[PDB]
């Protein structure tokens, strides 16, 4: 459930009827096969700081 620990989602979380949950990602991200993690799909995704992301690559 999305209200506890964000449903285990890195970003956005929807509840569905049942014990079902779907995570989703902002534009410029895609959801990995874990069903929870979001990875950028563009060079300048929202909410990341390029000079810090390049300091850690």
């Amino acid at each position: 459930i999305c209200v506890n620990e964000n449903g285990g989602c890195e970003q956005y979380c929807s509840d569905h009827t049942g014990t079902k949950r779907s995570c989703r990602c902002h534009e410029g991200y895609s959801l990995l096969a874990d069903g929870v993690s979001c990875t950028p799909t563009v060079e300048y995704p929202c909410g990341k700081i390029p000079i810090l992301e390049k300091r850690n690559a």
């Binding site: 999305c2 890195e10 970003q11 956005y12 902002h26 060079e43 300048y44 929202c46 909410g47 700081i49």
Partner: protein
């Protein structure tokens, strides 16, 4: 910003500077290549709506380094519920005339989904506030962008520890050392969650800055996600100022 530090160049890449006839007006936050979020009150005294400029990639106001990108403000959208000269509903959505170009120094802040913001981000204790505002109460504004980490208060705790409506939240410190200040309004209150930063507040206003006994007041962006998203899907309208129904 009182009691913060210089934001290292490029570390606040969503920060906007708003100018009117070249003069500092307010801050803002880039959320897409054409859309900036700011505070409604920043526009209470505008006469010439056609001379508003947004600058992205700014850092040191004394120099041009080539990372800055300036754009004309094409539309200023304010909720119908906002009353000039007051605090409640203090938000504006600004459409740029032409997109900015995303670069290492120009990057949007993520506008979160409402549920996520209410269920998750609202419980992250510390967030960053930034701007070129006054460095002290009754003091000069900053020439380099400043940033401050502030903790958020639940509104019941704000009131006890000090109107704060459901469209606002408090954050900061009651000992007069650390606050956002005049010149910072409109800028971001940005919250980190699992490796990404999100917009959770807008620097609003009140009586003084870093006043002992008082916390900073921020517009509660989670209340406006749907309003914002709908407007971003709409066509532009002639005339810069648009009042849009809220909710």
């Amino acid at each position: 910003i009182v009691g913060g530090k210089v934001c290292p160049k490029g570390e606040c890449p969503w920060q906007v500077l708003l100018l009117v006839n070249g003069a500092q007006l307010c801050g803002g936050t880039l959320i897409n290549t054409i859309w900036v979020v700011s505070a409604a009150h920043c526009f209470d005294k505008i006469k010439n709506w056609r001379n508003l400029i947004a600058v992205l990639g700014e850092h040191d106001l004394s120099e041009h380094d080539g990372d800055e990108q300036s754009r004309r403000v094409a539309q200023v959208i304010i909720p119908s519920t906002y009353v000039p000269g007051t605090t409640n509903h203090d938000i504006a959505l600004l459409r740029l005339h032409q997109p900015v170009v995303l670069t290492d120094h120009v990057v949007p802040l993520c506008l979160p989904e409402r549920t996520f913001s209410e269920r998750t981000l609202a419980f992250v204790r510390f967030s960053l506030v930034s701007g070129w505002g006054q460095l002290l109460d009754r003091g000069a504004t900053a020439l380099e962008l400043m940033v401050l980490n502030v903790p958020r208060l639940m509104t019941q705790d704000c009131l006890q520890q000090s109107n704060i409506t459901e469209y606002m939240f408090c954050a900061g410190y009651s000992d007069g050392s650390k606050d956002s200040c005049k010149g910072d309004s409109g800028g971001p209150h940005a919250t980190h969650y699992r490796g990404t930063w999100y917009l959770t507040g807008i620097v609003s206003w009140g009586q003084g800055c870093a006043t002992v006994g008082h916390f900073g007041v921020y517009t509660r962006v989670s209340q406006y996600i749907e309003w914002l998203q709908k407007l971003m899907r709409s066509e532009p309208r002639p005339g810069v100022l648009l009042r849009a129904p809220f909710p």
